[model samples]
Target: GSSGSSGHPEKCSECSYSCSSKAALRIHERIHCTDRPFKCNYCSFDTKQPSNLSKHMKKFHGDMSGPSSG
Candidate 1:
């Protein structure tokens, strides 16, 4: 075996526990694809990257206003 991006991409297990419904779909589906399977739970839309999730979560759902404020 060679060191080529873990080839496993088995990080979904984390979301498997940490998240559900939305997270669950993203983690698992994305794993079994190229580099992005981004499945939106809000309205069945799709996009790449995990951060985009938050993006949609903001406008689609509500503004996040950034992480914990100081």
Candidate 2:
């Protein structure tokens, strides 16, 4: 997390990788709907983006962190 406050309500730093803009989220959301490239190594769960998968792994799989999915 940088010094920039979460005032944009668009740039989600909670993500795993470097999502620096709102347009990125829009593109990522598309992948979620289409399930383009998101996959889980330990389960059948599918993801939309790499950062989302990382969050899931940390929150659900108890991993400290994961690499950027992109």
Candidate 3:
């Protein structure tokens, strides 16, 4: 039980982040331990965003007609 408001010398009770959410924590921590689920082809690397490997495919494979999931 607590009171809240703006400029209250507290956590502000606003859009702040602790990265405590398991999903968000992974994205932030991915920089260090670097375990990601967005698996890609050719290099066995991974990322948090799908764009990471879309560029990866275009750069390494010269085109991305489709992914390996077909």
Candidate 4:
């Protein structure tokens, strides 16, 4: 597994990325892709994940009533 830490060189030590775990490859690649593919059905905001959309809503629109599920 690759552990991304503050100020440390980020990479997977156990395997060359080409041969590393497939799940890890996807995650690592996302770190470089700035565009977020996910969209919020309820709002104009877009994010990389549904959780990020929920977080944005919680921060900006407390007007959204109910205990939220991201």
Q: What TM-score would each prediction reach against the true structure? A: 0.33, 0.36, 0.36, 0.30
Q: Give the clash total for candidate 3.
A: 0
Query: Candidate 3 residues 1-70, lDDT tens each?
Result: 3544343222212334234355665455444554677877678778888898788777787665565764
- Which digits, one per residue and each the tens of the lDDT, describe model 2 over residues 1-70? 4655645546434454335686777676554354448887777677768888888776788753556663
* Model 3, residue pairs in steric clash: none
**Candidate 4: misplaced stretches above 4 Å?**
1-37, 64-70
Please, what are the lDDT tens digits per residue for candidate 1 over residues 1-70?
2433433333355333233356555655655454457776657666787788768777686754556864
Give candidate 3 misplaced runs (Cα > 4 Å).
1-34, 63-70
- The alpha-carbon deviation from the true structure for residue 6 of candidate 4, after best TM-score superposition, in angstroms, is 57
Once superposed on the true structure, which residue ranges of model 2 sit more than 4 Å away at CA?
1-34, 63-70
Looking at model 3, residue 31 earns an lDDT score of 49
lDDT of 1: 0.57
Of candidate 3, the 10-residue stretch with the lowest lDDT total is 8-17
Best by lDDT: 2
* Cα lDDT for residue 41, candidate 2: 75
Model 1 C-alpha RMSD to native: 13.5
Return the lDDT, model 4, position 45.
78
Per-residue lDDT of candidate 4, residues 1-70 (tens digit): 3765344334444444442455656676654444778766566678888788878877777667666675
